[PDB]
């Protein structure tokens, strides 16, 4: 609605996807409510950003990493490994591709799917090694929400990377697949498997 004539002419589609709704890259950023206390506030879809790229003075105080967007976090995670280290643009592109793939698959909001995947991936209880004389006894311990989220983010990325290593399946696609798996809690994905293992370990040491 209302394409205003600026001397430097803008594409029609671009003009359309502006102003009226505070969208993501192309499509809408709304909805996506987690409905799982702990992972609300530390998975932030409340802040509507247009690209998975900011300057971002997030690593500064302590919990400002929470308020950093989910997409951005994902991109950062992807950026892992020296060969691919830095190169945030590439990561962003990959993320975009993944999102597109998600959209293509069963319609549905891509962001929502991602969120779901993240939720699935967070381990509830993890073990930490205690001294206790000398032997390697491992006490099971509860996981803090932010930490859990971080772990989830990592795990998916790792899985994607694994999939990529000697493969057609372009990292983005692998990531998308992983996300899908997480959404439909299958235990075919890597992150999910890891989580399960962790849970088992916790059970063993309780």
């Amino acid at each position: 609605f209302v394409p205003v004539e600026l001397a430097t002419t803008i594409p029609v589609e671009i003009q359309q996807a502006q102003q009226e709704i505070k969208l993501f890259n192309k499509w809408s950023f709304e909805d996506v409510e987690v409905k799982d206390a702990s992972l609300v506030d530390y998975i932030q879809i409340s802040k509507p950003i247009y690209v998975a790229h900011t300057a971002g003075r997030y690593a500064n105080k302590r919990f400002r990493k929470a308020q950093c967007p989910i997409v951005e976090r994902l991109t950062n995670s992807l950026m892992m490994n020296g060969r691919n280290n830095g190169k945030k643009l590439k990561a962003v592109r990959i993320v975009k591709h993944t999102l597109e793939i998600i959209n293509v698959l069963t319609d549905q909001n891509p962001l929502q799917v991602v969120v779901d995947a993240i939720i699935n991936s967070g381990p509830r209880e993890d073990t930490t090694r205690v001294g206790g004389g000398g032997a390697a006894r491992r006490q099971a311990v509860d996981v803090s929400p932010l930490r859990r989220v971080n772990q989830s983010i990592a795990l998916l990325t790792i899985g994607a990377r694994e999939a990529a290593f000697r493969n057609i399946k372009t990292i983005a696609e692998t990531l998308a697949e992983e996300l899908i798996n997480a959404a439909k809690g299958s235990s075919t994905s890597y992150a999910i498997k890891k989580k399960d293992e962790l849970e088992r370990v916790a059970k063993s040491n309780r």
Partner: protein, 63 residues
């Protein structure tokens, strides 16, 4: 899977032989006013919520 949704009222000191675990007093979401001191691994804050499997089992300072 019976899961208990817990909530943090007070951080009761950093614990463990090493650094990465914290003692936390916990008033759980449903059925309030039953405080348990349980251990939390990551970054913790007042009003954070904890997802957990095995609820009624109080922990102590790890050696």
């Amino acid at each position: 899977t019976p899961v208990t949704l817990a909530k943090v009222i007070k951080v009761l000191g950093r614990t463990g032989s090493r650094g990465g675990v914290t003692q936390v007093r916990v008033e759980f979401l449903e059925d309030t006013t039953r405080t348990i001191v349980r251990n939390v691994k990551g970054p913790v804050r007042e009003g954070d919520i904890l997802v957990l499997m095995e609820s009624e089992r109080e922990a102590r300072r790890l050696r």
